[PDB]
Amino acid sequence: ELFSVVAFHCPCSPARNYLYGLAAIGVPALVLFIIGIILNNHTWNLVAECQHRRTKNCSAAPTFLLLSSILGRAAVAPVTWSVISLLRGEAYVCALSEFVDPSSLTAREEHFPSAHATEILARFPCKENPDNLSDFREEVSRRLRYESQLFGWLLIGVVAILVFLTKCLKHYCSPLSYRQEAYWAQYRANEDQLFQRTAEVHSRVLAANNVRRFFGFVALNKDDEELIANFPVEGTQPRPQWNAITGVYLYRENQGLPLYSRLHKWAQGL
Amino acid sequence: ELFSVVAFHCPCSPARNYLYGLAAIGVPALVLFIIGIILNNHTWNLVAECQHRRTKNCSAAPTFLLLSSILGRAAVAPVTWSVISLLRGEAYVCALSEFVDPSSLTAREEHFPSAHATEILARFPCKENPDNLSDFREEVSRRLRYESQLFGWLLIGVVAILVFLTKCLKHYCSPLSYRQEAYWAQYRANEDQLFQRTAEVHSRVLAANNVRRFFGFVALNKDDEELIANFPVEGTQPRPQWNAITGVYLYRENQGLPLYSRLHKWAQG
Amino acid sequence: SQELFSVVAFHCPCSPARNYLYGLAAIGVPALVLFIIGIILNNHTWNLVAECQHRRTKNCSAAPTFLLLSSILGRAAVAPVTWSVISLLRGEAYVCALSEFVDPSSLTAREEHFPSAHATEILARFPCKENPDNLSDFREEVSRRLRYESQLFGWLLIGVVAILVFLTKCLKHYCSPLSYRQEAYWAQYRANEDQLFQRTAEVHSRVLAANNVRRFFGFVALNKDDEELIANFPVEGTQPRPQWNAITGVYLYRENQGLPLYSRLHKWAQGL
Amino acid sequence: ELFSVVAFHCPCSPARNYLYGLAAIGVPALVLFIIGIILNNHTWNLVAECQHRRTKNCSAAPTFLLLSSILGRAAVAPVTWSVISLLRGEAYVCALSEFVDPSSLTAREEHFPSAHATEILARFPCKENPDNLSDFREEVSRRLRYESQLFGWLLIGVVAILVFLTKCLKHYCSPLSYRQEAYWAQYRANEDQLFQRTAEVHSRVLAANNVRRFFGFVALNKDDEELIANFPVEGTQPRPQWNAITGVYLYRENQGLPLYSRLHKWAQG
Amino acid sequence: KDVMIFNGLVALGTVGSQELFSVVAFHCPCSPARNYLYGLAAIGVPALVLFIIGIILNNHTWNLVAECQHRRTKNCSAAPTFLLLSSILGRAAVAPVTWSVISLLRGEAYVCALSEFVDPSSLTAREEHFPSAHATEILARFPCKENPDNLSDFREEVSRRLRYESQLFGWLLIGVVAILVFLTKCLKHYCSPLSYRQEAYWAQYRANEDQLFQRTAEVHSRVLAANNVRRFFGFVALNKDDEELIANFPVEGTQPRPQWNAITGVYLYRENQGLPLYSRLHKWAQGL
Amino acid sequence: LNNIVSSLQRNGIFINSLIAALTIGGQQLFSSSTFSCPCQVGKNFYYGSAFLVIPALILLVAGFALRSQMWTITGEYCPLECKLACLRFFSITGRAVIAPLTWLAVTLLTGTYYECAASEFASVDHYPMFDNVSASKREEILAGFPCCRSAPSDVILVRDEIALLHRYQSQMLGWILITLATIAALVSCCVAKCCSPLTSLQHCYWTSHLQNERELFEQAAEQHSRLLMMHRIKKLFGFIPGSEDVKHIRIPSCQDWKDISVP
Amino acid sequence: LNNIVSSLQRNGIFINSLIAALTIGGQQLFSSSTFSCPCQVGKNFYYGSAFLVIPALILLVAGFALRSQMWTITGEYCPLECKLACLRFFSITGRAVIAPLTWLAVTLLTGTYYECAASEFASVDHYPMFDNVSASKREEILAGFPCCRSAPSDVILVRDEIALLHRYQSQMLGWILITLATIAALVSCCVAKCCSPLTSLQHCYWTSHLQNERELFEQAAEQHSRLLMMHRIKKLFGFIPGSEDVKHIRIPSCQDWKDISVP
């Protein structure tokens, strides 16, 4: 019942629930937004870019074209949570039930009291309303839910246009045809998955090369014995060599031919 | 349950629900429509055509045949969602509840109050009406649902006629016998399968040849060894070479023998 | 286990100046117990201790200790937080703690029918439902404001952690001289060495046990798979304590001849 | 079932139940404590060590740390049963029911009789109280149950710190790096498993020779002959040699090389 | 181990039987000076009996008798007697104790016992209301649960105070047996001449030899009988397994009568010039 | 798997436990079905007493008789041979007498049989209610209430007390009998471990040898009879049955059937 | 597995127990279905008595007749041969008579048959209620109440007592019979272990040999008949059936069918 713990509980109190409405919708949005940045590898080679130069000589022209991608590939997660809450309507109705104008209620005559209008309107989300106002609550509850469900649908539309706008500009302003970018897209993932796979193996071989020197032998599984018998190592990769394959790469052509990753630029010996 | 999330909940209010119903059906259609353009590769190369020339050399009339294809193919998503909502009728009745004329109401004598008309009619879809008007509530509910379904059945009828006119004229005015077009339509959908398939293989092979020069070897599975052994790579293809196989292509013939795709045109030098 | 869960479940004692002591214990102590478990299992805390033991002079400065000490708590302070947060979101712990501190005049939803004879006593009885029926509206009112005050803090606590984690992660990559990518290999090396070490320690343990039993019983009984172990992995003796003493201790990237060494063991494997 | 028999039954009687609470808790703790000592192997060679010296030749200080291991390992059962009883609270309320000060009672106006304060306060846990004081029976029970749970949580906290304190100092004060203790611990477990495994094989072979010598043959299962053939016995092993590989053992070095057990010391000759 | 599971099944067996017994057949005779004897017999009689089948079914018991009858001098050393006596009790005397404690723990056995002895003047919460002549008789009817509701107030305290005594008494019994087992184990190891690894090896050997002895003895009976069948018919019909035994096991013949007597009785554990002997059977083979 | 069951069947304790459980179940079924406790004043002790003794006696006789070896023991009866006969007789008796002991114990523990049995023997002079100057109706009602007659005339409570008393006594007897039985077993075992000349291991081996040779000789006798009959057929009909008969056939006449009718 | 069942089938005790259980079940079904206890004053003892005896007699005759070997025993009847015949007759009788004994015992234990049987024989002169100066209505009502007629005229309690008395007697008879039966068995066994010249093991071996040789000779006779018929066909049709017939065929004429009609 982990989902049962994070379930919404509207605190019916004036000037108080909309804070809770914010902090029970914004915070999971902020958590989801942060996770998107942290797990996105394109944000670390950005940080390591300004780290190693220590001067920030590079201007904002190459940064902004990448910086949007950092948020874009990550900002989807908050939106698909922000929109879901609005569609459910629970988040908005409890947030704004205090602000309903006591002169804008319909479907009933002038039966709304004026002693504590904000207080009595604040308790509508909790259904703790006297039966003489049940018409009023089912009017405010359905009206506010509209406003949320209207905003949620509108928000989906705005993303539905920004994505199409971006996907057009990213293909109209870039100097490469899309069929070549798909290759360049199919190369970044093809290399990275090979790199991670080959990093683990060259780690294990180096490890088994040290434990042996400490025990005289190394315990390895039957399939792991193939690894040592196939991929011998002579040492370690120097730090400056490790420092030339970290960072941001922007389509540097070489002698009339293209290079698709910063590693590739080093592969030719550049 | 995502069904409960995207459920159509009618806000019974005057001058308010039709605005909601407009944005509760049209917007998903817009999203469905946007998806169709984005995924359809026939629109990127049309965009890619506009970027390389930078001058608008190509005339609009030759491109209108392809321009109608992207909109036409993607038009299923709005229609298959606009129609389904109309036939269900929930979207329309909540939208047009407040426009029903009280004087033209039937099935009952002239006892309909007129002090606040739109307020009562707006509340019909939510069933929040006194039972003294239940006959009126049901009568408007059925009549409004009738117009939705009649509009819905009209909508599907119009699309079917449009498809019939489209396909009949497309085959009539095309300069190739329809049997050849089937072979052609069995080519572009066949090249793109091979071209995608070798795109990865000539990528992964180029991936391995880069890691190996760095680490000193490359981890591979049993199948991947065949990729490196059978298909060796030497370098990369020039950027202008990539530029010659992207865009639109309209049956340019060579010497009297057809070229079916722009890549095939480049394959003859 | 329905019986085990029932034992640990919260039982709020409705009494003044008493429940918030229990509320402190019913959450703080399980947090403290979880935190202690976090320290012990963290292998980095032991070679930290062993570093403070072998040198006997406090050779390392604050900076080498500070950088590691952050990892000790970070890999371990998760457990208390995911327990403290889960408690606050439930709200039962908080409402029991502060049920005797709401100001009676701040109450609403009812006129000044709130008795002032012994305010703290009647307020403290709210969480256990032990309230007069005439104040059931007040009981719910406090039962919601205090639930809110817990829940807002529970969500607020998660937000603060979600900033520190991002701030800590960003600062480490910007401050460490290594590229982020080389750290991934370094992380991928400590795990491989440790797993191979522990697995291969067992085998070099069993062989020594097998060798010693043979001298006593006159022979040794092995399973089908253990028979290969004796022949494939023969040993000649043991390893001196100083040799065991050069591989237990915090290691921070001593480069050699321009080529990195990734752990104490690796430095020893080069005889440096 | 078993739980029904050993189910706590509070004797509602003054000056009497707290005796029952002690026995219904201490005795289960005392019994479980004994099993901890009895099953533990490190306690017998400790006793067996006193057998051979018989004169306290070895100092008590080096052997103290083993005594810390025997109590620590065994104490899990009494604590995990003492804690459970405290958290349940049944033991404590019946233990301290009759000691609640009537003056400090609250949640009710002063209707508490003083004719038999202890007696009526003794009968509270067993529902044998006047209903006019039923609120008191809830008030006293809740306060007492509060005290039990606080002690339970404090106790588990102190055990939590002591486990850490005795594990922080043990690594600090031991003369070996913690990794050597990792090998040493993995060696001890391996030795005992292999040592016990050979005992079955050595006995079964030795018994075969004696039975063979007296029936003229032996009846064997499928793998017994393999045991007989592969592992023949040439005799037995002298008692004093066995005595050299029994008893406690401290880390002692030989020619700059460690010896992890007496059996290792014996095997080195 | 094998010993613990063997004891565990017996402990479960009596507890279930005790639960079964306490349901079908236990009716406290509410008659003065009759339940008291009935209560005592409701505990001791199953206890004394269950101890008896423990002695009879123990194979080692007759081994003690055989040596005692053969030697007529009790020449058996203290240590082997310590082994056997602490073996039979640890294997047999467990059952009565488990029955004894659970009977006390449930309390229905004891509540009958001291119901006679309950002091009418010791009652509290009200003035003592019992005639000087029928006070004993009315108390004897308390356990039957047929007492009038007027006497129900006084009955519950009495039926619980004794039930308090039973559970407290039952727990105290557990303490004594638990302490004794701990005390005996230390005495067993302290007074033994050989370390526990030797004791483990020896007791582990004793099971293996006797298990080997039993299997061989049954086979030796079959092969000896089969050979006599051949002598009496001139031919023998055997299945696959038994026919292999006769071809693989030659018949040594009949062992001398003293040889059989030499392999029964108690073990003197006389080291053969420093070489240990772990049973009489082992000594006989190494002796000749 | 079935070999394990046969191995446990060889365990005498298991078979005796099975016998005891079966006897207890049969006794319970018999009591719940066909007891009815006849309530006649004249001879009611007879019915209960017979229910107690006759089933025990018939079970004892059945246990003694169902063992075939006791017939051979008696035939030998009608040095070491006497000792061996005594040992075998004691061992067989044990299983012969376990079941009736179980029946008596369970019947006494239940108490119904003793309740209806000695009911008219109750002492009523202590109770002042039973005056009965007639001195005959007293015995009538005394035998009348225990069976099914409540007779709600204040006597019911009295009768329950009487019932209780008898029931109490019944329980004691059962346990008393149990005690004696166990004691007997012990001393009986003493004899089997005092007068026995063979060793404790010698006795078990000898018994296994006896069972093995009995089964072996029975199999050999069956096989010898089979071979003799085979020989009779191969001498009469001229061929061995079960083999290739296509060689020769005697075709016996009418006189030949008479010869094989001798045995 | 089925071999074990056949092995237990060879156990005579098991088959006799099966017979007893089947007879008890059949008796219970017959009593619950088709008894009805006719209530006529004139001849009611006849019905119950016949229900007691005729089923027992027919079961006894069936048990005696269903054993084929007793026919051979009688044919031999109509030295050692006499002793062997006596032993076989006793052994077969045991199983022949077990079932009717079971029927009688279960019927008496149930008591209904005896209840309806000797009901009119009850003694009523002791009871002062039954004066019946007519002396005929007394017997009529005496036979009338036990079957189904309650006749609630104060006599019901009396009738129950009478019923009880008869029922009590019935039980005794059953057990009495049981006792006698067991005693008979014992002394009968004595004869089988006193007049028998063969050893106790000799008798069982000899019986196994007899059964083996009987089955073997039956199989041999069947095989000899099969071979004779095979020879008849291979001499008439000229070929052996079941073998390669493609060699020769006799093609017999009309006269050839007459020759094979002889046997």
PDB file of C-alpha atoms in Angstrom, chain F residues 12-23 98:
ATOM      1  CA  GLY F  12       6.789 -54.058  16.236  1.00  0.00           C
ATOM      2  CA  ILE F  13       6.045 -50.782  18.006  1.00  0.00           C
ATOM      3  CA  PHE F  14       4.308 -49.435  14.900  1.00  0.00           C
ATOM      4  CA  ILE F  15       2.132 -52.524  14.433  1.00  0.00           C
ATOM      5  CA  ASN F  16       1.158 -52.528  18.114  1.00  0.00           C
ATOM      6  CA  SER F  17       0.271 -48.833  17.855  1.00  0.00           C
ATOM      7  CA  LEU F  18      -1.855 -49.613  14.796  1.00  0.00           C
ATOM      8  CA  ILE F  19      -3.590 -52.394  16.729  1.00  0.00           C
ATOM      9  CA  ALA F  20      -4.255 -50.062  19.659  1.00  0.00           C
ATOM     10  CA  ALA F  21      -5.656 -47.302  17.447  1.00  0.00           C
ATOM     11  CA  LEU F  22      -7.883 -49.734  15.552  1.00  0.00           C
ATOM     12  CA  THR F  23      -9.197 -51.240  18.790  1.00  0.00           C
ATOM     13  CA  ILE F  98      -1.723 -55.506  24.071  1.00  0.00           C
TER      14      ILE F  98
END
